[PDB]
């Protein structure tokens, strides 16, 4: 076990981890951060997204060792003192969700998407989205939620 | 004033927002595998390598001393409980844990009990089994022939089962709905005849979120709880409590936020048995959550129908008969959901949307070494399969006669005046209005424009690219109720629906459904904000806890709308009927004195004198007049008369890329009418999400076997599932015809675009070559089987 | 097998044994403290040093830089939210947090919320404020005086106040019940007239599990969730609602296992408002408990009535009228728990168990610098104080004409052949009969013995102890309901129950009341059992959760089992009626013709053919018949008729020595009647304590205030609690008279033990010095109190 | 500055570091969630914090949890064997010697020790030996009952 500290959420973490413990397991057993979930184990579905070190990636596909000194955010850090992040916003106002699965994911994504590129077209969101996956909302929704949010980010 | 009282109730036909969104958007939603509780072990499951084979010895001992096992079980510690094998919603029996012999590739064979998923998936690679492999079927034709070897041994000796007598020892049933000699009668004298063959291929419905449970036995209070990813979680109640012994009043499972079921979560698996066993055995909670590739290779799958449909017309295409035969492989033990007196669901709903006088079916189920299953990917009962062969059809008998398609269509619609309609097979189809609906698409598209750019591309044999057009008109069967003849393992398939309002004007409701993303939090609580005049926001809904909520089916076949929202409805309109006699009282006058008006009720005449539903609830609690309990409540449970039938029609433009045998849908235009609309924000989502799960099986989706038995492409990586990328933009319209018999004329709609948009692609795609005398290609069309059909036709570059 | 069957059942009647004692005895019970929640914070409340005085200024900035305080509020951080202050149950407001004054001794001044209880504790001692003392109010005379300093300055200029008329700053109310005219026209000229100052003792319920709750507001979901001590959460969340402005449907409290209410919480004290609004603020989780301390000090007190009994009669011992005047010391707020329509409760029934023709009592209430209260304590709304005062008037009334008390109670009673009996008072007396039931006590202790053994002792001048045999006969009124006259804050007293058969015969109850101990999930289960067929341990019940559980008042003044146990009884009937009808449709006969034997429905001069409620619950699940909704549920409010009026006679038996005043219960005998008993066991224990408490009343308890008002004895160091030396054996005794109106002739009883056990032993005390003519003593009877009685009547030592 | 120690609790060892302040009762319920010992006041009169510390009956809201580093301790959720109630929690179950059940957990673990420093004591001795449990709803006389059921069935 490596003892390593990893600031999630703005928080500093410091652990003892076993190596083979990947970083969705470490949020989701560790420090209880369920948003972030499992839908695939060949790293396809993209629904275990987080932001680590200003890029998102997937925690599945990751160790909690190799985040030590690393800056972690997910799902449960976007709201700000209470105030819903501007893709939060969109997803719920554009109906961008409905079983609520792959949303934690796809916030994660939308989030360091929309910095990577502020004003994208409808194909660069769909092609900027590919890493996640839906099974309810036909993406159709999604694409407007991330059209809204940029819209506000840009406000 | 009064239109703005209406507004603010945010009630039916209202797009307002969801409700259930807040927790999910922020990460704090509760599914199963986000469950902990004290002293909570993880189990997992060690699985067969081979399709079938008995087994000689299972090793535990490497595994038992591990660091963190804490037990392994196999088939041996569930004879004492009777728990090694367990009765289906098909009447039949399937392996808990695989007792003499293996079944299927991936079959549950023991489990392993440990500290967490960690050590347990360790265990489950200690734990070593030797077999005696034993020849394997996998075709449904081999394994009716003579000398196929014997599958289910256990059956041995038996000359029927639970849907009739028995043929052979791999014949699971035999059924059929129609008029077979007036059918046989009109084919043998029809002027004009077609016959096809095709293939539904088997899919999965792969929900994002797998199954899986926590379940929790309390030695101290004797009772069991168990946290579910279930469609159905009160009947799951009731079994678990006969096959435990635990009086169901002690029993309670409890469906929390579930992410996405589409059928795939409506049986009891393996696993939760073994959860629960082992709970009930350690004292202490176990949780099992299956991997995706466990979830694909051993859940329910869908579809897997081999058809051949025939049709009878006269030259100028008035369909005189339907027949069809059909061939289903249902794996190797029968647990296919459905009402325990249709084997092959709701299939005699092929003669579609068409008058046709007479017709017959004949389905045939067959046993193979495969995962069970059949009923789960928003198929409505085999619906899926009724509606594409019937379609498909129409497409082969346009072409003989150089008809157009849609002109086929709207010749042999049942017009508007016909409904009730009762069809060949029995169904009194509720209502309908086909021809404006199909004149609303084609205008929309400009449907003649389209076939000349068609005509203009084929005239040319240079064109790099092949266009095609595919339309389909399609009639929903949704609502799975009727006592008399749907029941699941001897409960009618009502649902219900009970609803409380406090003192202060706001409410609590539950049903006995559970949703598993598709609104009910949102959509429920509309129904009930019209009903009662009181705000949506404010009427807080919750389902899935057998404890707290009234007994119901579950949903699952889009039976929700139809089944609990008339429910719903009713138990809210004797809430209202009680609320005017309050009124009455407190206004001192007569009840039929009075005027529901939004959200109050009006003296006739004299508006400055009325009494708000707060006003209402308020005095039920203060002091009841006179003849009244105290109080503002009610609960009803509806046994719905008939099913209710939406329809559809909808239209797609491919073109595929000759070089290459790529398709590439240009268009995809869906007009869906479902009666009333609740919430057409919600109803749109749901559109958009079947379309897309129709374009993944269509164009992509397939579970192919090997000579072996072994089950390829069941991971994400060759497993279809579309990107926003492939995924392409819907177009969707609507029409209004509300059911007659609903009590707000509201139909399921949730499993329309994935039941009508499969047939549509296909549509699609063998149109491109219809004018090179192409009737059918089996899907999935990718680009691989598209290029195959292009070189076979000369068209390939 | 049918007296088997019934015994089965373990149904009415039956001493089966508790289904809640599983959970105790292993620990497993769930009570506030042990809650613990995500992120949950610890609160801890600033009091009050002094008694009365005003708050010059809150020292916050050292606790605030505490490491672990996340907050520190004041009656500031209440203002903008109008919580500063709340109603209370009585009509009068209640200082949540005291903001320019403090009104009593440990009253609510500020509150800290830390990581944990320890730095809480901490953050309170770091916490210095400022006050500047004022006079002091502690007697109710005093109190009234014209110069006496004015307490409540925020009702200053108010002539009126929730109960009449306010003629001094400090004077509450006045309220009155009976004939005074004609009352006062019997004392006027009647022959024989005694009069008897007594005064009933400040005492505290001190339940052994104290106050506290954990509040929890979810930003995200945005809904209140408190776990808390009440004894009615349903009330709770509707007037949290209201202070809150929170929707009553997203507010949820939950009284879990409760260890002992005893009427102590039925209130919302300022420290549940407090963690609340705490909560909301700090969006997460904040529990409070409080200290022995706190809850003896400032939680709802019981008693403190100084009365005025007067009893007017002919030489033979019958009685002409009662005349009574009370001073009740209510202290700062008047917050004591009451129907709204009775500031005094149901003092009214001090008629007793006697035909009296003319009486009038008058009560009236003053404010003090004390902690709110008066009615806790198992007192059913001050029938402790009129049993107490009639009986020992009774006994002042016998010594004087030097009647037996056994003698003049016989001649007084209210005879059999009178029920249902209306008092003077208004009270409708379901059914008695007083006399068999002395007769069978006075015969069990041999009565006329016991008084020629005290004539011998008193023969010699020598005897070092003193012989004292005390006698009370009692009418208790319980069940507070009838909406028209009770009501608490408006809402209607009823209360309810729910229960729903499962499909294999097992079922789930709720009801609107919350047990403390007394055994609901045991009997409420026993009503059921007998009612429905089906046996009480698979009949699983639940209270507390006002998401789940019908609206209901409550659990207190041994409403429960006349009230909701009626309601159990007449939703379970609902039931029984629809099984009726559904026995009927399988056996293919008429209703009539069927037979209801302990657990079936039998055809009529045919054993042979019946269907039992198991096979009844499956046929509603499976196939409801024509014209019924599918399940088999019921849920009933009750608002009863009439309350129910049970009785006891109770013998006690003391020996006082001379020397040291010490006093010896050598025998105490009671008999309760409470019309059908439902399980015997449990009604026994409930005697049990309820004497126990009686004893600790009369020989023990008292909350004594210095000239400073300063509470004394306010710990355990002090404040009397017999353990298992000091507790006599009880010697219990019963008689059956049902209560006519009630739907299984059940009367409360848990109130009883207490309300008549009190008196008895002042009967006792008294008795031992009634030969040197001491008509009453004061209590407690501690060995100091009664040394200075022998003291002063020359019989010490 | 929080001691490391290392308690046995009802056969198992409990490895926390807690303040030297920390008393026993908040250890057990707190740091280790073995809610089953309560607590009823603040000067060590009621007892319902009784657990039994290296063969004695000692109320844990007067004692250190710092000063148990390698003590015994047992507690009321380790009364039971393989689900087989103890002889004393059958006593008060069959002898309805608890009503709310606050103070059970405490009498339990005296019950438990008391029958061992007097395996036949008569009713006076009962009373006398279960003196420092305090309860506000039995009335003790069924709770007497209990430990002559509980003591009849330690003999047989
Ligand atoms: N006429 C209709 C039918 C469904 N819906 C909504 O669409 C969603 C799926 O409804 P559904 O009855 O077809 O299917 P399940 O919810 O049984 O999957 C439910 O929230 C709805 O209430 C609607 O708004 N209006
Ligand atoms: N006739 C009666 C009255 C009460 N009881 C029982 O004694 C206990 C206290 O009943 P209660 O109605 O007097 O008081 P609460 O339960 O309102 O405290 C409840 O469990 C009972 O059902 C009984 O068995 N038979
Ligand atoms: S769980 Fe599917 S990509 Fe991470
Ligand atoms: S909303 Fe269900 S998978 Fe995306
Ligand atoms: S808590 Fe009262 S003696 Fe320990
Ligand atoms: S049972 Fe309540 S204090 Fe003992």
Not at chain 2, 212 to 225: E, M, Q
Not at chain 2, 743 to 761: D, L, N, Q, R
Request: include cysteine; glycine fraction near 8%.
């Amino acid at each position: 076990k490596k003892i390593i500290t990893v600031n999630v959420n703005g928080k500093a973490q410091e652990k003892a981890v076993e190596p083979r413990t990947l970083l969705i397991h470490f949020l989701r057993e560790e420090l209880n951060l369920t948003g972030a979930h499992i839908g695939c184990e060949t790293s396809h579905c993209g629904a275990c997204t987080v932001d680590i070190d200003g890029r998102s990636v997937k925690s599945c596909t990751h160790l909690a060792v190799q985040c030590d000194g690393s800056e972690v955010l997910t799902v449960e850090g976007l709201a700000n003192k209470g105030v819903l992040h501007a893709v939060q916003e969109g997803f719920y106002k554009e109906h961008g969700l409905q079983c609520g699965f792959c949303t934690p994911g796809m916030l994660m994504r939308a989030y360091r998407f929309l910095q990577e590129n502020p004003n994208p077209t409808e194909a660069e969101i769909r092609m900027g989205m590919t890493g996640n996956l839906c099974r309810c909302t036909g993406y159709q929704n999604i694409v407007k939620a991330v059209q809204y949010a940029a819209r506000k980010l840009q406000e | 004033d009064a239109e703005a009282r209406e507004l603010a109730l945010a009630g039916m036909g209202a797009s307002r927002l969801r409700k259930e969104d807040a927790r999910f958007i922020q990460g704090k939603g509760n599914y199963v595998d986000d469950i902990k509780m004290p002293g909570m072990l993880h189990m997992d499951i060690v699985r067969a390598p081979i399709a079938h084979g008995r087994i000689k010895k299972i090793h535990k001992d490497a595994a038992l001393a591990m660091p963190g096992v804490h037990a392994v079980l196999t088939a041996e510690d569930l004879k004492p409980l009777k728990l090694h094998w367990m009765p289906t919603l098909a009447g039949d029996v399937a392996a808990v844990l695989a007792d003499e012999k293996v079944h299927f590739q991936m079959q549950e064979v023991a489990i392993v009990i440990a500290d967490d998923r960690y050590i347990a998936a360790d265990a489950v690679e200690a734990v070593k089994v030797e077999y005696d492999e034993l020849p394997v079927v996998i075709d449904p034709i081999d394994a009716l022939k003579p000398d196929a070897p014997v599958l289910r041994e256990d059956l041995a000796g038996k000359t029927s089962g639970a849907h009739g007598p028995r043929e052979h020892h791999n014949h699971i049933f035999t059924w059929g709905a129609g008029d077979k000699a007036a059918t046989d009668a009109v084919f043998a004298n029809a002027p004009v005849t077609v016959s096809q063959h095709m293939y539904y291929p088997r899919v999965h419905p792969c929900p994002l979120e797998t199954c899986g449970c926590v379940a929790s036995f309390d030695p101290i209070k004797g009772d069991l709880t168990t946290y579910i990813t279930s469609q159905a979680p009160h009947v799951v109640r009731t079994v678990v409590s006969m096959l435990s012994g635990i009086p169901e009043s002690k029993v309670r499972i409890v469906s929390p936020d579930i992410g996405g079921g589409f059928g795939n979560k409506v049986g009891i698996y393996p696993g939760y048995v073994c959860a629960i066993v082992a709970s009930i055995v350690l004292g202490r909670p176990v949780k099992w959550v299956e991997d995706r590739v466990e979830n694909i290779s051993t859940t329910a799958f869908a579809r897997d129908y081999h058809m051949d449909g025939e049709l009878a017309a006269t030259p100028d295409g008035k369909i005189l008969g339907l027949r069809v035969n059909v061939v289903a492989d249902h794996g190797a033990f029968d647990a296919c959901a459905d009402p325990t007196k249709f084997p092959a669901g709701l299939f005699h709903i092929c003669s579609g949307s068409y008058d046709i006088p007479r017709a017959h079916c004949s389905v045939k189920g067959v046993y193979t070494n495969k995962a069970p299953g059949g009923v789960a990917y928003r198929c409505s009962f085999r619906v899926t399969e009724a509606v594409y062969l019937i379609e498909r059809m129409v497409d082969v008998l346009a072409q003989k006669l150089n008809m157009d398609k849609a002109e086929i269509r709207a010749k042999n619609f049942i017009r508007k005046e016909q409904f009730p309609y009762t069809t060949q097979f029995g169904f009194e189809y509720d209502s309908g209005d086909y021809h404006t609906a199909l004149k609303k698409v084609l205008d929309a598209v400009d449907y003649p424009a389209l076939r000349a750019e068609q005509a203009a591309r084929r005239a040319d044999p240079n064109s790099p690219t092949l266009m095609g057009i595919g339309l389909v008109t399609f009639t929903e069967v949704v609502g799975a109720g009727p006592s008399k003849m749907c029941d699941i393992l001897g409960v009618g398939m009502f649902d219900s629906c009970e609803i409380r309002i406090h003192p202060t004007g706001s409410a609590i409701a539950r049903m006995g459904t559970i949703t598993q993303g598709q609104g009910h939090q949102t959509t429920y609580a509309q129904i009930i904000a019209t009903e009662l005049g009181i705000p949506s926001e404010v009427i807080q809904v919750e389902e899935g806890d057998t404890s707290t909520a009234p007994y119901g089916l579950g949903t699952y076949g889009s039976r929700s709308t139809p089944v609990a929202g008339a429910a719903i409805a009713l138990a809210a309109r004797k809430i209202h009927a009680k609320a005017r006699k309050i009124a009455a009282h407190m206004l001192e006058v007569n009840e039929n004195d009075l005027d529901w008006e939004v959200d109050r009720f009006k003296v006739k005449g004299d508006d400055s004198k009325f009494k708000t539903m707060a006003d209402i609830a308020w005095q039920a609690y203060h002091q009841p007049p006179a003849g009244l309990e105290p109080g503002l409540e009610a609960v009803h449970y509806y046994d719905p008369p008939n099913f209710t039938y939406p329809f559809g029609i909808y239209l797609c433009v491919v073109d595929i890329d000759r070089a290459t045998g790529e398709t590439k849908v240009r268009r995809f235009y869906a007009l869906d009418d479902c009666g009333t609309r609740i919430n057409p924000m919600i109803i749109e989502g749901q559109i958009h999400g079947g379309l897309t799960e129709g374009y993944a099986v269509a164009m992509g989706q397939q579970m192919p076997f090997d000579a072996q038995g072994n089950l390829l492409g069941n991971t994400l990586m060759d497993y279809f599932l579309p990107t926003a990328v492939e995924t392409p933009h819907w177009e969707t319209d609507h029409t209004v015809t509300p059911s007659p018999h609903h009590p707000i004329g509201a139909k399921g709609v949730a499993e329309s675009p994935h039941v009508g948009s499969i047939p549509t692609f296909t549509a699609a795609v063998v149109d491109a070559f219809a004018h090179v005398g192409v009737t059918h290609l089996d899907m999935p069309h990718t680009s691989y089987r598209v290029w195959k059909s292009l070189k076979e036709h000369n068209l390939a570059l």
